[PDB]
A paper describes a structure:
Full-length Cep3 rendered CBF3CC relatively unstable, but the complex with an N-terminally truncated Cep3, in which the Zn2Cys6 domains were missing, yielded a 220 kDa complex (CBF3CCΔN) that was purified to homogeneity and was suitable for cryo-EM studies. Secondary structure details and side chains were clearly visible throughout the CBF3CCΔN map, enabling an atomic model for the core complex to be built and refined. The 2.5 Å crystal structure of the Cep3ΔN homodimer was fit in the map as a rigid body, and this structure is essentially unchanged after refinement with a final Cα RSMD of 1.1 Å. The most striking secondary structural feature of this model is an eight-stranded parallel β sheet. This is part of a larger solenoid structure, corresponding to the predicted leucine-rich repeat (LRR) fold of Ctf13, and comprises eight LRR motifs, rather than seven LRRs identified previously (Leber et al., 2018). The remaining flanking density is an α-β subdomain that decorates the C-terminal end of the Ctf13 LRR, formed by insertions within the last 3 LRRs of Ctf13. The Ctf13-Skp1 heterodimer forms the left side of the horseshoe and makes extensive contacts with the base, formed by the “proximal” monomer of the Cep3 homodimer. The “distal” monomer of the Cep3 dimer forms the remaining side of the horseshoe. Ctf13 and Cep3 line the channel with basic residues that are strongly conserved between Saccharomycetaceae.
CBF3 comprises two homodimers, of Cep3 and Ndc10, and a Ctf13-Skp1 heterodimer. Cep3 provides sequence specificity through binuclear zinc-cluster (Zn2Cys6) domains homologous to those found in GAL4-like fungal transcription factors (Lechner, 1994, MacPherson et al., 2006).
Residue numbers in the entry:
A (entry chain A): 54 to 320, 330 to 565, 588 to 608
B (entry chain C): 4 to 38, 75 to 189
C (entry chain D): 4 to 30, 88 to 156, 164 to 202, 257 to 482
D (entry chain B): 54 to 317, 339 to 565, 588 to 608
Write the structure that this text describes.
C-alpha cells in the first residue's frame, strides 16, 4: 500500500515549522554559568573598529549606497543626500570631547548605514577600497585569509556591534527617539537578526515600545496640520510598515510581544488598504501574504481553500503591479527593487502551491511546485553574472532555498519521480553556488539536506511494517524525535530552575542513525 | 521575437510573444529581467497545438474580467469556441487540464461551460436513476430506496 | 457521459465545472432520482468544503409534515431536499459542524412559519442558521425568536415598507417587541438590501445603531444619495448591484472650495498622464481615469487634497459596482483603493469620468 | 446660578489624572541637544560608588532587611536567609578579574536588595553604619550637609544606578533571565520609578519580555509534575501578581505595553486583590464615562469583605515584619476605601459621602500619626503614602477652594501640617507637593477676591481658565511629536489676571 503519504505530508508542516524555521535560525543554546561577562563592555573592540575607518573610505561607502542600495533605506531614512551633512558633522564632531544624545543618535544611524554598505558590497570593490592587513594585525587570526575567504562577514558583524555600542552610549532606554528604530531597520537587512536572535528580539521590543510611545495610528495627515507635521507622519508611516515587515521576519516562541495589528488582506486596528502604496507597504503586503500562508504550520487545523484562492488572486494582482512598476533602469535602483519584489512574489507562489500539494492534493500541484522552483532557480542563476552578484545577498534568498531544498529532499525520500530528481540536482548545484556571506548558516543548510539524502537510504533498505491501525518504520521515529529534541531545546523552564532553583531492531536502528546524524548539529 | 513552448512529448512549438501573452504564465515567466523557451510538462502535443490555435483565434477579443463572478454566470457561449471544443471527452478534459496549468481563465471557463452543458442535460431517469460510485450507501439503504421507488 | 472519470478528476477543476452549473442541475422534473445522483452530492460536498461560496441557498421548510432542508432554483423551483440526519451524515462523509443555513420568510406561509419555528426550537437545536431573509404577523413571530438565534451573521431586507421600520435609526419608538432586541444587533456582520427605490427618503439613511458591519449590499435600488448616508465605526465594504442614476460624494465640490479655482479651470487641471502603465490591465475602455498634475500643485497641498478625499470616505476597503448607467456628481476616488484592485467597476460603458487621487510611485 | 459644582467635580477627574499623577510623577522634561551622552557609561561613577560599600556594613544591611522588611521582598525573592549564600559568593568573587553572567545576575539582585535596605532605613542606624565625609569628598558639595538634608536619597539613587550598571554589564538585552524581574521588583519598592520614569518603563518592558519568554499561563500544580516545577510555578505566580501590581503603579502615556491580562501565600493574593480593586476604581480617571451604581456597590461589598479579612489578620509586637505587613495592608484598604467614597462624592452626589471622605481621611491621618513615634517611623517611607497623601491633599484643597466648611478646614490644616512632616527621602516630590498645595491656596484667594460671572450660557472665572490651561500645558508637554520632528531632520482685565497668575504661579515648576 502507498497510503502512508498524506499523513506524512501533513507531518511535513510540523517538521518545517520546528526544524527549518525555528531550530535553524531562531534558537540559541545559552548557558549562563559559562558565557563570559561583558567586562570589556565592547569599548576596546569598537574603539578599534571605529578608528579603523577613514574619511574617504566612508564617503566611498556612501556613494556606493547612494547609487545602488536605495530600495532598502529609501523608506527608512528617506533621501541620503541629506545624510552627507550628517557624515560631515560626524567627521567634524569626532574631535569633540563632549557629545550630545542627538549627535550620538545620528552617529549610530550612519554606522548602521555603513554596516549595510559593508554587507552589500562585492569582493572586488571591497578589496579595492579596504585593506585586509590591519585586521589580521589586530584580530590575531590566520594571515592568509582574504575578503572572499570569510573576513567580510566579521567586519560587517563588528560594525553592527559598534552601531549597537554607540546606541549603548546614548542611554537609549532613558531617551526614546526614532533614530533607534531607523538604525534597526538598517541592521535588519544584514544577517544580524540571524546572528543574535535574542539581541535582535530585545532591540525589536525596544523599537516597538519606542514606536508606540508616539501614539500615532493613522498616517494620513489632516487638514489642520503643520506641513512639517504631515511630512513627519508620512516618514513615520514608512518606518512603521518597514518595522512590521522586519517584525514578522523574527517571529517564533521567543518573540511574544507582537506589533502585528496590521489586518491581513481579506480574511486589526490598522487596516492596510488605506495607505498610498509605496515600496515599503508593497513589501509589507507581500510579507502579509507570506504570514497568512505560514500560520498553519504548527496549528492542527487545515486552511480553507477560500483563503488559498484569495491568496492566488491577490498574488496575480501584485504580480502584475510588479510588471507595472515602471521606473528608469539607468539608475539600477529599480533593478534591485524589481528583483526583491519578483523574488518575494515567487516565494509566496511556491508556498501557496506547496500547501496546495500537501493539504488538498489538487490538479498538478507538484508540477507547479517544480515550475516555481525552476523560476526561483532562474531568478538566482540570472544574477550569477557580473556587476550584480551581491543581489544574491539579500537574506530572503537564504530563507526560500531553505524552504525549497528541504521539501524537495523530503518528498524525494518517499515518492520517486523523474522531474523531482533533476530538480533536486539543480538545487544541489544552486546551494553551493550561493554567496559565502551566509557563512556557517549556509553550511548548516547543506548538512540538513545531506541528512535527508541519507534518510532516503534507510527508507530503502528497511521494509515497512504494519499493525493494521498505524504504520511503523524507523524514519517515522527519527523524524518524530527531531521535533521532540528541538521542542525540548525551546523550553525555558530549566533556565527558570537554573535561575531560582537548586538543580527490537527498530529502536537499535533509530539510535544508530541519531547517534550518527544528530539533528542538534543545526542549532545555533 | 518569437517564444517557443515545449510540449510533453517533446515537440517544440513556436508562437509570437504578443500571442503568448494570452497565457497568464508567459507574461510572468518572461518578465524576469530585460537586460524565451517555456516547458509545459504532461501535455500531449496535439492538445498544446489546439490551445495555441485557440490563442491565435482570439488575438483581439475583449474577455470580461478576472474577478467578475456574475459575467461568468451570464454566460457567453461563443460560436467558434462551441465549434472548437466539439471533441471526445478525454481530449476535452486534457484541454481543460492544460488551460488550468497555463493559467488561462477564458479557455478554462469555456471548457467548463461545455462540461456544464453536458452534465446539465443528462438522461432523466436513465443515467440519473443509476448511481454508480456507490459509497456511504449501505445495501440496506439502497434496498430502502429501491423499495420506496414503488 | 462517464460519471466515474469525472469523479476521479481533481478538485478545483471540478469546482469550476460546478461554478457554471449552479442552479440548473436538470435543463419537467423527476425529483425522485435527481437527489441520489453522485454529482449532486459532489456539488454539496465541495460547497460545504469551501465555505459555502457556491449556491448556498439551503432553506428550512415544512413539507410532507416534516421539517427538511431544501434548495431552490434561481427561478425558485425546488431542486433537492434533505432530511437533516441525511445531510449531517454526508457532511460527515465530506469532512471525514454546519452553521450557514439561509431562512426565508418570503418563500413560506405564516401558518407553517409558526410550526417551523416551534418544532425547530423545541426539537433539538434552534441553531446552525446564518441568514434571515425579511421582506406582518410572521415577521413579528420571527423577531421574538431572534434573541435565542445564537449564530446569525446576515440580514436581508426587501422593499421600502419593511426597511424604514427596522433598519434605519429614525424611529426610536416605544415598541420593544416590534424591533430588534440589541443582542442580535451585536453580531450582524452583513446586511443586504433589495427590491426598493430610495434608501434615504422620508428622513435619513443612518446606520449608526448597527455596530460591526464589514459588508453591505445595495441591490436593485432606483435612487440613492451617498451624501445623505452616514456609516458606522469599523465599516469595511460597499457593494452596489444594478441601480439607476445615483449621486456620489461631494469630494470635487470640496476640492473646488479648497483651491478657490473654477470648474473649467479645474477641467484643465485634471491631468491624464499615467493612464498607460497599469490601468490598461483594468480593461475599462470607456472610463479614462484622470489624476492631478504634479507640476500644477505643491506637495503639502496634494497631501491636503488626499485628506479632503478621505473625509466622508473614512473606513472603506472596496467599492464594487455593477451596471449603474449614470452617476451625477463627478467620481473622484483615492488611489489607495484604486492602485490595488479594490475599487472595481465592471460593466459601465455609460460612465465616462473617473478621477483618481494619490501617488503611483 | 450655582451649577458649576458637578461639572467641576467631573473636571477634577481630568485634573487628577493629568496633574497629580502624570505631571508630578510621570513626566520628565528632556532635551536631546543639551543632555550629556555619558561616554564613560557611569564606569567612573559606579566604580567608586561600589568601592565605597564595605562588607560588614552590607551584612548589617542584610540583617536589617531580615528583621524589618519582610513584607516587601517576600513577593519577589521569598526568604533572604537563602540569599546570604549568594552575598557570601559575591564578596568572595569580588577580588577576581573575569566574571560570569549568572554571578552578575546575582550581583544585580543583591545590589537591588541593598537599595531597598538603604531607602527604608531609619537615620540613626544609617548614621552609625555609614560615614558622611567621603560622599562630600566625591560630590564636592557642602561638608555641613547631613542625612536628613537629602544625602540618603543620593545614596539610594547611586545604588540604584550601580545596580543598573551591573545589569548593563550582563548584556541583559541578549540574555533574558528571571533575576532581572526580581532585581527590578526590589527596585520598585523605592521611588526609583519616580526619579527616572521612562528608564523604569523600559526596564518594565524588558521584564514583561523576560516573563512572557517562559510561556507559563496557569500556575496550578498538576499530578504528573516534578514537585520542583510546582514550587517554581507557585513562585512564578507570586512574581506575576506582584509584577502586575508594580505594572499598574507605572501606567500612563509613556508606557503602552501593559501586562494586565488578569481580571477581577495568602498575603500576596490579598495584596493583588486590593490592588486590582484599586485598578477597577481608578480606571475612570482619564475616561469620559462614569461607573454604574451596581459597580460601586459591588466594590463596596468586596471592600467590606477585605476589611473583615484585614480584621481577620493578626499582628505581632516582637516580630516587626507583622506590624509592617499590617500597616501596609490596612493603609492600602483605607486608600481604596477613600477613593471609593471620593467617587461616591464626585459622580452621584449621594448623601453620607463627604462625611465618609472626612472619616477615611482622618483614618489615613491616624495611621500616619501612629507611626510618628519611635520604632516605626520608616513606615511612612513607602511610596503608597506619597501617592495617597498627594491625592488626598489635592482633593481636599480643591474642595476647600469651592466649598467652605469648618470640618473640611480643620482637615485641611491637619493635612497641611502632616505634609511638611513627611520624611525627607521623598525630597523634590515633597517640595513640589507643597508648592502645588500653596498654588491651590493662592487660587482659593483668587477665587475669593474675584467675582464669578456668566454670559447667560456658561460661566467665566480666572480660576477655571487657569485650571484648564494647566491640563492643556501638561498635555502639550507629554507629546513626542516635537522629538519626532527633531529626530527626522533638523527642520481684557480677565486675560490680564489670568496672565499675571500664570506668570507668577507657573505650572512648569512641578515638572522634572
Amino acid at each position: 500500500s502507498k497510503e502512508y503519504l498524506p499523513d506524512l505530508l501533513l507531518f511535513w508542516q510540523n517538521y518545517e515549522y520546528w526544524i527549518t524555521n525555528i531550530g535553524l535560525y531562531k534558537t540559541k543554546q545559552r548557558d549562563l554559568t559559562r558565557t563570559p561577562a561583558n567586562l570589556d563592555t565592547d569599548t576596546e573592540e569598537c574603539m578599534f573598529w571605529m578608528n579603523y575607518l577613514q574619511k574617504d573610505q566612508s564617503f566611498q561607502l556612501m556613494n556606493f549606497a547612494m547609487e545602488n542600495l536605495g530600495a532598502l533605506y529609501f523608506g527608512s531614512i528617506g533621501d541620503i543626500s541629506e545624510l552627507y551633512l550628517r557624515v560631515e558633522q560626524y567627521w567634524d564632531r569626532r574631535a569633540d570631547k563632549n557629545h550630545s544624545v542627538d549627535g550620538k543618535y545620528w552617529d549610530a544611524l550612519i554606522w548602521s548605514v555603513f554596516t549595510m554598505c559593508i554587507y552589500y558590497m562585492p569582493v572586488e570593490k571591497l578589496a579595492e577600497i579596504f585593506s585586509v592587513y590591519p585586521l589580521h594585525e589586530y584580530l590575531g587570526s590566520n594571515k592568509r585569509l582574504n575578503w572572499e575567504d570569510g573576513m567580510q562577514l566579521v567586519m560587517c558583524q563588528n560594525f553592527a556591534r559598534c552601531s549597537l555600542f554607540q546606541l549603548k552610549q546614548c542611554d537609549f532606554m532613558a531617551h526614546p527617539d526614532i533614530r533607534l528604530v531607523q538604525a534597526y531597520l538598517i541592521l535588519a537587512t544584514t544577517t544580524f537578526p540571524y546572528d543574535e536572535p535574542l539581541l535582535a528580539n530585545s532591540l525589536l521590543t525596544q523599537c516597538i515600545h519606542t514606536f508606540k510611545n508616539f501614539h500615532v495610528d493613522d498616517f494620513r495627515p489632516l487638514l489642520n496640520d503643520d506641513p512639517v507635521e504631515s511630512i513627519a507622519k508620512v516618514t513615520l508611516g514608512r518606518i512603521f510598515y518597514r518595522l512590521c515587515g522586519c517584525d514578522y521576519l523574527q517571529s517564533g516562541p521567543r518573540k511574544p510581544i507582537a506589533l502585528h495589528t496590521e489586518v491581513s488582506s481579506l480574511l486589526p486596528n490598522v487596516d492596510v488598504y488605506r495607505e498610498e502604496n509605496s515600496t515599503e507597504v508593497l513589501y509589507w503586503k507581500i510579507i502579509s501574504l507570506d504570514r497568512d500562508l505560514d500560520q498553519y504550520l504548527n496549528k492542527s487545523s487545515k486552511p480553507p481553500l477560500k483563503t488559498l484562492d484569495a491568496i492566488r488572486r491577490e498574488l496575480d494582482i501584485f504580480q502584475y503591479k510588479v510588471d507595472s512598476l515602471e521606473e528608469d533602469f539607468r539608475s539600477n535602483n529599480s533593478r534591485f527593487q524589481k528583483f526583491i519584489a519578483l523574488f518575494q512574489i515567487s516565494t509566496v507562489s511556491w508556498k501557496l502551491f506547496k500547501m496546495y500539494l500537501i493539504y488538498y492534493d489538487t490538479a498538478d500541484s507538484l508540477l507547479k511546485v517544480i515550475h516555481y522552483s525552476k523560476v526561483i532557480i532562474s531568478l538566482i542563476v540570472n544574477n550569477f553574472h557580473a556587476k550584480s552578484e551581491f543581489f544574491n545577498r539579500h537574506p530572503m534568498v537564504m530563507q526560500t532555498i531553505t524552504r525549497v531544498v528541504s521539501f524537495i529532499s523530503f518528498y524525494q525520500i518517499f515518492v520517486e519521480s523523474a522531474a523531482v530528481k533533476q530538480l533536486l540536482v539543480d538545487l544541489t548545484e544552486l546551494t553551493a553556488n550561493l554567496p559565502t556571506i551566509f557563512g556557517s548558516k549556509l553550511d548548516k543548510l547543506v548538512y540538513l539536506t545531506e541528512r535527508l539524502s541519507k534518510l532516503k537510504l534507510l527508507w530503502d533498505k528497511v521494509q515497512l511494517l504494519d499493525s493494521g491501525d498505524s504504520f511503523y518504520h524507523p524514519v517515522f521515529k527519527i523524524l518524530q524525535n527531531d521535533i521532540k529534541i528541538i521542542e525540548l531545546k525551546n523550553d525555558e523552564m530549566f533556565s527558570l530552575i537554573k535561575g531560582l532553583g537548586s538543580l527490537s531492531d527498530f529502536r537499535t536502528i533509530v539510535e544508530e542513525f541519531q547517534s550518527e546524524y544528530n539533528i542538534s548539529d543545526i542549532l545555533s | 521575437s518569437n517564444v517557443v513552448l515545449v510540449s510533453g512529448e517533446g515537440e517544440r512549438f513556436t508562437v509570437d510573444k504578443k500571442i503568448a501573452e494570452r497565457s497568464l504564465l508567459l507574461k510572468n515567466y518572461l518578465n524576469d529581467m530585460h537586460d524565451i523557451v517555456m516547458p509545459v510538462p504532461n501535455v500531449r502535443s496535439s492538445v498544446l497545438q489546439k490551445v495555441i490555435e485557440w490563442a491565435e483565434h482570439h488575438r483581439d477579443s475583449n474577455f470580461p474580467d478576472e474577478d467578475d463572478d456574475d459575467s461568468r454566470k451570464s454566460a457567453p457561449v461563443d460560436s467558434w469556441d462551441r465549434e472548437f471544443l466539439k471533441v471526445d471527452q478525454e481530449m476535452l478534459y486534457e484541454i481543460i487540464l492544460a488551460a488550468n496549468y497555463l493559467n488561462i481563465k477564458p479557455l478554462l471557463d469555456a471548457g467548463c461551460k461545455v462540461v456544464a452543458e453536458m452534465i446539465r442535460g443528462r438522461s432523466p431517469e436513465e443515467i440519473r436513476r443509476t448511481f454508480n460510485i456507490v459509497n456511504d450507501f449501505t445495501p440496506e439503504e439502497e434496498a430502502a430506496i429501491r423499495r420506496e421507488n414503488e | 457521459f462517464n460519471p466515474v472519470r469525472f469523479l476521479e478528476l481533481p478538485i478545483d477543476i471540478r469546482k469550476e465545472v460546478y461554478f457554471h452549473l449552479d442552479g440548473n442541475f436538470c435543463g419537467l422534473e423527476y425529483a425522485f432520482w435527481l437527489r441520489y445522483d453522485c454529482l449532486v452530492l459532489d456539488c454539496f460536498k465541495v460547497n460545504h468544503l469551501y465555505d459555502g461560496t457556491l449556491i448556498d441557498a439551503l432553506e428550512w421548510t415544512y413539507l410532507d409534515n416534516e421539517l427538511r432542508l431544501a434548495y431552490f432554483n434561481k427561478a425558485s423551483m425546488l431542486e433537492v431536499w434533505y432530511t437533516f440526519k441525511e445531510y449531517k451524515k454526508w457532511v460527515i462523509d465530506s469532512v471525514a459542524n454546519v452553521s450557514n443555513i439561509q431562512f426565508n420568510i418570503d418563500n413560506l406561509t405564516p401558518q407553517l412559519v409558526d410550526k417551523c419555528l416551534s418544532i425547530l426550537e423545541q426539537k433539538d437545536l434552534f441553531a446552525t442558521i446564518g441568514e434571515v431573509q425579511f421582506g406582518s404577523i410572521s415577521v413579528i413571530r420571527t423577531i421574538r425568536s431572534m434573541e435565542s438565534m445564537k449564530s446569525l451573521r446576515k440580514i436581508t431586507v426587501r422593499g421600502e415598507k419593511l426597511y424604514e421600520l427596522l433598519i434605519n435609526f429614525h424611529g426610536f419608538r416605544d415598541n420593544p417587541g416590534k424591533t430588534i432586541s440589541y443582542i442580535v444587533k451585536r453580531r450582524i456582520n452583513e446586511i443586504r438590501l433589495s427590491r426598493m427605490n430610495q434608501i434615504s427618503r422620508t428622513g435619513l439613511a443612518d446606520f449608526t445603531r448597527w455596530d460591526n458591519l464589514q459588508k453591505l449590499v445595495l441591490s436593485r435600488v432606483a435612487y440613492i444619495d451617498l451624501n445623505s448616508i452616514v456609516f458606522p465605526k469599523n465599516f469595511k465594504s460597499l457593494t452596489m448591484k444594478r441601480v439607476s442614476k445615483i449621486k456620489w460624494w461631494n469630494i470635487e465640490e470640496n476640492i473646488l472650495k479648497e483651491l478657490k479655482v473654477d470648474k473649467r479651470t479645474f477641467k484643465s487641471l485634471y491631468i491624464k498622464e499615467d493612464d498607460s502603465k497599469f490601468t490598461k490591465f483594468f480593461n475599462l475602455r470607456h472610463t479614462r481615469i484622470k489624476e492631478l498634475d504634479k507640476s500644477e500643485i505643491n506637495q503639502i497641498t496634494y497631501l491636503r487634497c488626499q485628506a479632503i478625499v478621505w473625509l466622508s470616505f473614512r473606513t472603506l476597503n472596496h467599492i464594487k459596482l455593477q451596471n449603474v448607467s449614470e452617476v451625477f456628481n463627478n467620481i473622484i476616488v483615492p488611489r489607495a483603493l484604486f492602485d490595488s484592485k479594490r475599487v472595481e467597476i465592471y460593466r459601465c460603458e455609460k460612465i465616462s469620468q473617473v478621477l483618481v487621487i494619490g501617488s503611483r510611485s
